[PDB]
Amino acid sequence: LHHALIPHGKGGRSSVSGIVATVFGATGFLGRYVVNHLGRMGSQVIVPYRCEPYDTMHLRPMGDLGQIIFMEWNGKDKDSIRKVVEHSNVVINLVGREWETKNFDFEDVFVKIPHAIAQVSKEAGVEKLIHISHLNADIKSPSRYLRSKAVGEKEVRAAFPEATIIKPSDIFGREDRFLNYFASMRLGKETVKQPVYIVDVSKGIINAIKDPDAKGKTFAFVGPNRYLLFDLVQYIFAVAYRPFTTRDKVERVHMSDMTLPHLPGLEDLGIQATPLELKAIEVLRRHRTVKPAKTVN
Amino acid sequence: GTSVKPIFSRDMNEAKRRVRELYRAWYREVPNTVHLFQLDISVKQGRDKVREMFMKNAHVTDPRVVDLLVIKGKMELEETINVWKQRTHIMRFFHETEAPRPTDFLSKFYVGHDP
Amino acid sequence: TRPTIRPRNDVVHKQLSAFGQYVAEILPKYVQQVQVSCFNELEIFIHPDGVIPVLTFLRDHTNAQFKSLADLTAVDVPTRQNRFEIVYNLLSLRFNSRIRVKTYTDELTPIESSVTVYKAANWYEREIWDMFGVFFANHPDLRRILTDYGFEGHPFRKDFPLSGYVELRYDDEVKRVVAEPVELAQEFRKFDLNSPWEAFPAYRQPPE
Amino acid sequence: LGLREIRIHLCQRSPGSQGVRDFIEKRYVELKKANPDLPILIRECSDVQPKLWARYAFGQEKNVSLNNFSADQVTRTLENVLSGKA
Amino acid sequence: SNIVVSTRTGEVMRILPRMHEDINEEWISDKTRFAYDGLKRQRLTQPMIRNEKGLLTYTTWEDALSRVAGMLQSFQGNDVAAIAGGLVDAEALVALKDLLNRVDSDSLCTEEVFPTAGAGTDLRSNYLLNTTIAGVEEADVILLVGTNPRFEAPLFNARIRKSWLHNDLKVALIGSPVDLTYRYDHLGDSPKILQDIASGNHPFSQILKEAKKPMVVLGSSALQRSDGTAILAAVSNIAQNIRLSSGVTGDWKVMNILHRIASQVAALDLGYKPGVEAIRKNPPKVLFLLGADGGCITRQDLPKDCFIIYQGHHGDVGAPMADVILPGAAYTEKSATYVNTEGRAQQTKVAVTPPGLAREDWKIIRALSEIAGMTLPYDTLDQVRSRLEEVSPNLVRYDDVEGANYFQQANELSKLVNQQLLADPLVPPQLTIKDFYMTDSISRASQTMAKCVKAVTEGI
Amino acid sequence: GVRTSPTGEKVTHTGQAYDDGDYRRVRFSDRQKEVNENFAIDLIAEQPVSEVGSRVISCDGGGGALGHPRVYINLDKETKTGTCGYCGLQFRQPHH
Amino acid sequence: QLIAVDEKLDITTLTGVPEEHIKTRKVRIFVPARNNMQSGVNNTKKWKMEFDTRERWENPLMGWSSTADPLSNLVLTFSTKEDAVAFAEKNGWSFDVEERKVPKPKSKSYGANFSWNKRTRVSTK
Numbered sequence A: 001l002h003h004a005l006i007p008h009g010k011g012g013r014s015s016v017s018g019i020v021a022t023v024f025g026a027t028g029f030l031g032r033y034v035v036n037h038l039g040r041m042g043s044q045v046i047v048p049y050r051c052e053p054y055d056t057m058h059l060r061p062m063g064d065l066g067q068i069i070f071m072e073w074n075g076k077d078k079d080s081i082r083k084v085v086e087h088s089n090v091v092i093n094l095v096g097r098e099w100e101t102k103n104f105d106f107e108d109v110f111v112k113i114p115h116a117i118a119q120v121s122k123e124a125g126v127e128k129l130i131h132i133s134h135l136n137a138d139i140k141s142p143s144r145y146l147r148s149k150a151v152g153e154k155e156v157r158a159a160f161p162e163a164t165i166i167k168p169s170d171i172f173g174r175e176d177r178f179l180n181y182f183a184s185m186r187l188g189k190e191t192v193k194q195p196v197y198i199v200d201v202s203k204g205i206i207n208a209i210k211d212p213d214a215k216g217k218t219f220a221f222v223g224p225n226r227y228l229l230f231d232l233v234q235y236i237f238a239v240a241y242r243p244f245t246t247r248d249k250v251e252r253v254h255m256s257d258m259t260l261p262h263l264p265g266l267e268d269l270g271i272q273a274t275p276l277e278l279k280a281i282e283v284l285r286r287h288r289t290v291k292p293a294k295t296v297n
Numbered sequence B: 001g002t003s004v005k006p007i008f009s010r011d012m013n014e015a016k017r018r019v020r021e022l023y024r025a026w027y028r029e030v031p032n033t034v035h036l037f038q039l040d041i042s043v044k045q046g047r048d049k050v051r052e053m054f055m056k057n058a059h060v061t062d063p064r065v066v067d068l069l070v071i072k073g074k075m076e077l078e079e080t081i082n083v084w085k086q087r088t089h090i091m092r093f094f095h096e097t098e099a100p101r102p103t104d105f106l107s108k109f110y111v112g113h114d115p
Numbered sequence C: 001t002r003p004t005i006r007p008r009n010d011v012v013h014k015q016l017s018a019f020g021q022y023v024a025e026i027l028p029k030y031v032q033q034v035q036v037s038c039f040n041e042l043e044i045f046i047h048p049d050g051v052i053p054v055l056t057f058l059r060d061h062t063n064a065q066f067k068s069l070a071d072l073t074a075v076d077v078p079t080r081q082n083r084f085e086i087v088y089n090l091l092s093l094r095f096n097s098r099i100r101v102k103t104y105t106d107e108l109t110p111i112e113s114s115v116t117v118y119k120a121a122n123w124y125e126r127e128i129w130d131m132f133g134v135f136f137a138n139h140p141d142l143r144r145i146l147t148d149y150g151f152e153g154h155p156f157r158k159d160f161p162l163s164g165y166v167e168l169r170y171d172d173e174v175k176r177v178v179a180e181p182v183e184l185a186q187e188f189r190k191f192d193l194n195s196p197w198e199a200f201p202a203y204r205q206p207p208e
Numbered sequence D: 001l002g003l004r005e006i007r008i009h010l011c012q013r014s015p016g017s018q019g020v021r022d023f024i025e026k027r028y029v030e031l032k033k034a035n036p037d038l039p040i041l042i043r044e045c046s047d048v049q050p051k052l053w054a055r056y057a058f059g060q061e062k063n064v065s066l067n068n069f070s071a072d073q074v075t076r077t078l079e080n081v082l083s084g085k086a
Numbered sequence E: 001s002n003i004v005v006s007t008r009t010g011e012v013m014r015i016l017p018r019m020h021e022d023i024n025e026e027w028i029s030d031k032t033r034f035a036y037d038g039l040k041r042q043r044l045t046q047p048m049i050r051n052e053k054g055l056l057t058y059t060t061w062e063d064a065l066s067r068v069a070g071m072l073q074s075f076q077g078n079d080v081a082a083i084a085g086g087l088v089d090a091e092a093l094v095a096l097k098d099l100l101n102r103v104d105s106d107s108l109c110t111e112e113v114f115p116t117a118g119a120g121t122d123l124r125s126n127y128l129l130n131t132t133i134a135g136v137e138e139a140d141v142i143l144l145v146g147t148n149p150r151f152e153a154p155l156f157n158a159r160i161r162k163s164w165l166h167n168d169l170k171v172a173l174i175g176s177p178v179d180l181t182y183r184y185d186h187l188g189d190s191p192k193i194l195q196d197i198a199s200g201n202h203p204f205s206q207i208l209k210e211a212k213k214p215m216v217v218l219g220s221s222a223l224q225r226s227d228g229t230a231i232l233a234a235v236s237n238i239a240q241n242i243r244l245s246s247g248v249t250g251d252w253k254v255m256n257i258l259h260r261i262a263s264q265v266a267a268l269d270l271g272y273k274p275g276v277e278a279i280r281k282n283p284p285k286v287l288f289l290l291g292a293d294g295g296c297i298t299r300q301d302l303p304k305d306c307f308i309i310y311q312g313h314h315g316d317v318g319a320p321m322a323d324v325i326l327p328g329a330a331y332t333e334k335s336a337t338y339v340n341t342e343g344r345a346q347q348t349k350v351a352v353t354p355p356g357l358a359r360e361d362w363k364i365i366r367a368l369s370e371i372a373g374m375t376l377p378y379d380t381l382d383q384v385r386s387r388l389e390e391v392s393p394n395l396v397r398y399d400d401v402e403g404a405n406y407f408q409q410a411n412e413l414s415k416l417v418n419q420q421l422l423a424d425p426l427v428p429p430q431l432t433i434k435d436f437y438m439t440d441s442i443s444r445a446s447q448t449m450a451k452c453v454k455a456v457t458e459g460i
Numbered sequence F: 001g002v003r004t005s006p007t008g009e010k011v012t013h014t015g016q017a018y019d020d021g022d023y024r025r026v027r028f029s030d031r032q033k034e035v036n037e038n039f040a041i042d043l044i045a046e047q048p049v050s051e052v053g054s055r056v057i058s059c060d061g062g063g064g065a066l067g068h069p070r071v072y073i074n075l076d077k078e079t080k081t082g083t084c085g086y087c088g089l090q091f092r093q094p095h096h
Numbered sequence G: 001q002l003i004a005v006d007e008k009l010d011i012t013t014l015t016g017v018p019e020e021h022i023k024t025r026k027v028r029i030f031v032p033a034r035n036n037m038q039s040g041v042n043n044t045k046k047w048k049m050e051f052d053t054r055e056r057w058e059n060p061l062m063g064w065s066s067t068a069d070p071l072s073n074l075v076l077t078f079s080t081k082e083d084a085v086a087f088a089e090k091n092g093w094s095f096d097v098e099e100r101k102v103p104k105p106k107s108k109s110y111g112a113n114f115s116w117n118k119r120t121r122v123s124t125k
């Protein structure tokens, strides 16, 4: 196991966990939680950042001295990926943009970059690769985002046969784009949503890293309760004490949440999914200046 | 013999009385503490935590020790009443950032040498 | 004794010994011992119950009037049954002199608070309670003064570890400062500096 | 049910081990003549009651106290243990 | 001998002597002093299992423990077996005893051979140094049979030399004319001289007759040569003749046995069967090598597809012939109980922690039992030592050397068999200084001991 | 005398260099490894051996109070040369 | 004015030590052995109470020696063994006590070196 990688300590800040993890897209909403969960337990995190060094500054106190190493990269080049994942044994893929840019479309973000990452990871000898796709990802879907996810998920599994795919279902959190999106508005009764908490997704990724038998498996990370869109927005506006993103976001948010009973979930990794009723107040206490919504099961 | 000097009580009955009075005050305070410090826990959780803290010291069989713990708990209560603490001090009672340390022998054996 | 040795004062030694006699004679109920060191420091060892009475007498007597309380502290000697040693340092401006009063206690026996005699002692006593866990009865407001709010333990006790038990950092998950068990990147190096071959024969103890 | 070994714990100086001691010094030899393959361990206690252990198949063990037992009583209980009779 | 391990930043720096007036006084042997170098070399740090090509590859604790528990559940009874090495503590020994007892197995064997005929290991004084190391200072004549104590027990020989210098103690040797650093009366080499002394013909019988505090010491090396029963019977006969003719001077305990490995007395007190002949009579299908590195049992002395588990701390002659390798702790990395040839039980302390993924030996056995469903009752070290007290109460008295003298029973039990002696002179393994340095796995992996052997073979 | 590892890393005067499988090499990516080029062992090997016609010679390292403590070296063994314990300079009696 | 209550002293609930640093630690009470590199005996006079060694690992950066137990450097000094046992008992620590080892008196004689008939006669001095 290459002695330098043997775990040591009591699982603390200055301990060693034997995890050399390269977290692509660590500067996002999910990336900060993933990096924090990795670094609070003694693992080394390599972070590749396209953006200014100032943006990443928040991550600095997430690990002990020398445990977090920042390097620059770009998806268009393979040498940068090779030098970033050269020494890692775990590669986590969190790259993803919800919209379109003049240099990166959904095909660039969700297909080419993950495929190149998986190919380089396989070439370099990375033991484990974890990929993030969507719960609603299928080739036939009208939305480009979901359609792109399906093509990418397939091509990654082709490149890295023993990769682990995680399909979170509409993550919500303190910096999320769901509850913030509906609380900033200040069409429904047919769309049902299945949100999942951000801490649960991060712990699921960590457990999938620590779980040996989850090599080729695929997971669907879903919350405890299913909510209609209308009464969920009603609850969101009630918590904020309020009276009651171009084209792809609306078409994706009016799309109902799929159900995949065959795929293993968070409970198979040992995570009790946290109900949205506990964390809604935590997220929405800042939008201010109780009667939870009914759930369908 | 073994004569010792009292702090507040003469026997264990008065110590129990003081413990009950302190528990009364803490139970009264939990709702105002949760509301004022803007905790994300429920008043049920805070009161259960108070119960757990009081239960930690249930095996004490010495009035001097018991009313010394009562004095300490009263100091803590006065800290919480006057808002001398912050959210961080109050939140610590819950260890929400610490990984669950396992108890079974097999799990401990795998992680390391610490018994 | 050539220039490298501290000069000795016999007159002050005699005067302090005489005043030790005087204080001893006046208060036989509480005083247990009187000592005058080689560097002319006079200390009186008394019973804990005499703290209010001994302190009041030193301050008010026409021959003592030790009206100033320079310092009040405690010393931890775990080998003793009465663990803590409470020390009072008093200054008299009238006679330009200093006195020391020593007392003993343990974990569960309180000491009478001398805030009534000296207003200076108030904060001092609080510090002792914060640092050693010595309780003072009838203290106007006894609580921690130096340690963090919610800090468990008394750091200046000899069995308290140097780095304590918990340490603070910032957690972005809970978005707040949290306290976790202490882990050190480099552990403190304990040095065995003491040598054999005793240095001062005048303090040799009987071999029992 | 099959016996695999016995262990006799006796104290060297305690009065309660007195008769137990005599057992060995009288007749342990004879015991070993009858059982050429059963391990009879003899061990020494201190400030603890004398005791005889019997170990069966699958690691089962039963212990019996021999405090103030004479040589006759120890011989009888050893016979009962060896024969299997209760 | 008591030592002090000096560490710094969790690394062993040196071994110093520690004063025990009754065991080693103030000295330690060069092996004790300088063989700590091997603790940093040839170490086993991670569990290993055999892959498809047949090679040993690293794997986690769960994999190796499950693979061992599978075979432990599949087989039962006499098909399972165990061998104890020379550096094993009482806790691991009793753990293995209980683990195989839950499988109905008594095949607990040790590499060192002690004759089991008659009393065997039933009477403790039958395999101890009843005179004790200190008591050598009170003897006035000593007889050594087939030993080279200068290398087998250097501090024992140092005490003998001190008594020779100060008490005019007279020494006689039956064995090869080795150098013992003092003049001794070489009675001869052939073992039959013992019988001659038993007969009364040889004048040394008269010499031992007139002694107030005689002493006969027999080493286990002379008990290895397949004449252990006969030689032990002859020595016990000599002791019986001395006690019977000269009379019982008191509690002098003439009969003495000098041991050579650290784990022998602890194993014998726990009911282990000395020798490995029980393995030879009933070859097992799965074998536990609890630190066994002597090469007494190879794969030729075992059936095909034999499952061999090695639990130890150095890769040595025992490791490459195994199927599952479980890394254990060394004597400097665990609080462990060892019993010396005097029968005195002493406990070590934890100086460093086992490197890598290595763990405490008894913890390894307990976890393996808990996997296979035969969960051992004890969880912590205090409970293990309570179990040890139940099995043998003398293993918890940590400085006592006193014990009962049951010489008469063991002597009369040895007269049943009448096995004959070979016509082979007694030749100890430790013939010269070059054979003293390399003795066990820690010494063999030591570079300093290699330098010492090189210097002895050719000096500069 | 700086060398180079098979992987490409420079070898320090202490001989340290990460092996091929060691992840810690990641710390040197896009950066450099701090290595001293002047090896003291090679530099002291280049010094001449002095020849003094006395059995005992004293060395303070040069500079007087700016050197090391004074030591005395015996030069009676003709098979080798006397080496200062602090400075490393070598001395010798004039053989032949 | 005096309770005159009878119970063994146990202050574990007042010291603030974490739970697992009381019921898992094993303290050792002993008189430290004399260093064999020196002949002085002034360091073997008092009794020391120390704790059991826990794991020390390597820091991935700088390769230092990291620890996770706070009581790794705690050593306490007592006049008598009874004082140490009392302290450990009132603090709730399970302890192991070792009895003090004293070098036995010895009979030294300079004249024995020059013996007429004994083996104590030294070859050189």
Ligand SMILES: NC(=O)C1=CN([C@@H]2O[C@H](COP(=O)(O)OP(=O)(O)OC[C@H]3O[C@@H](n4cnc5c(N)ncnc54)[C@H](OP(=O)(O)O)[C@@H]3O)[C@@H](O)[C@H]2O)C=CC1
Pocket: A024, A025, A026, A027, A028, A029, A030, A031, A049, A050, A051, A074, A075, A093, A094, A095, A096, A097, A098, A104, A109, A132, A133, A134, A135, A167, A168, A169, A170, A171, A172, A177
């Ligand atoms: N709604 C949700 O929260 C859940 C998201 N999805 C998946 O989860 C993944 C990440 O989650 P999330 O935190 O919400 O996403 P974010 O928008 O918060 O962050 C996107 C991450 O990917 C990086 N990134 C994005 N585009 C590029 C690019 N063209 N080149 C290099 N790096 C890039 C970002 O770096 P930078 O900031 O510098 O651009 C950033 O690190 C995504 O891939 C998404 O598909 C899973 C289910 C729902």
Ligand SMILES: [Zn+2]
Pocket: F059, F060, F061, F068, F084, F085, F086, F087, F088, F089
């Ligand atoms: Zn020099």
